[PDB]
């Protein structure tokens, strides 16, 4: 798991978000974290996914948004995967991110 912009540790603590990336497996093990790791890369790779805004909290983090899944993945200034989840356009936080890029 921990190879590239990913680490097993970070993936583990963020698996709680995997359900937003099409992975409903309620179990958290090496094999599921893997599907999580994969669903993230596939997200970043999608042609429809583009950089949009940042997670102010994390200094120079860049966030990649996919208008289809409405998901966002946060990458730290150093390219390390930070976190990610699905944007809710009906919620003020979601719309604010959409209008201003501030996550």
Partner 1 sequence: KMAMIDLAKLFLASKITAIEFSERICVERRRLYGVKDLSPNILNCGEELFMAAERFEPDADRANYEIDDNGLKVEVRSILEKFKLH
Report how many residues bind partner 1 under the rule CB under 8 A: 16
Stretch that binds partner 1, among 9-17, 35-43, 44-52 (CB under 8 A): 9-17
Stretch that binds partner 1, among 29-37, 39-47, 78-86 (CB under 8 A): 78-86
Q: Which candidate, 73, 69, 75, places its Cα nearest to that of 89? A: 69
The C-alpha atoms of residue 83 and residue 18 are separated, in whole angstroms, by 10
Q: Which one of residues 47, 92, 99, 100 is an interface residue with partner 1 (CB under 8 A)?
A: 92
Q: Does 54 engage in binding with partner 1 (CB under 8 A)?
A: no
- Least separation in angstroms between residue 59's CB and partner 1 is 9
The C-alpha atoms of residue 26 and residue 29 are separated, in whole angstroms, by 10
The C-alpha atoms of residue 103 and residue 95 are separated, in whole angstroms, by 10
**Any idea which residue has 């699905």 for tokens?**
86
Q: What SS3 class is residue 72?
A: strand
Tell me which residues touch partner 1 (CB under 8 A).
Answer: 13, 16-17, 19-20, 57-58, 83, 85-86, 88, 90-94
């Amino acid at each position: 798991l921990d190879s590239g912009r990913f680490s097993r540790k970070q993936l583990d603590k963020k698996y709680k978000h995997a359900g937003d990336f099409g992975i409903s497996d309620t179990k958290k093990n090496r094999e599921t974290l893997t599907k999580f790791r994969d669903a993230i890369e596939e997200h970043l790779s999608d042609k429809d996914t583009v950089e949009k805004g940042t997670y102010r909290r994390e200094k120079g983090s860049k966030v990649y948004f996919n208008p289809n899944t409405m998901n966002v993945v946060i990458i730290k200034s150093n390219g390390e995967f930070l976190s990610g989840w699905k944007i809710n356009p009906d919620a003020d936080n979601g719309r604010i991110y959409l209008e201003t890029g501030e996550l």
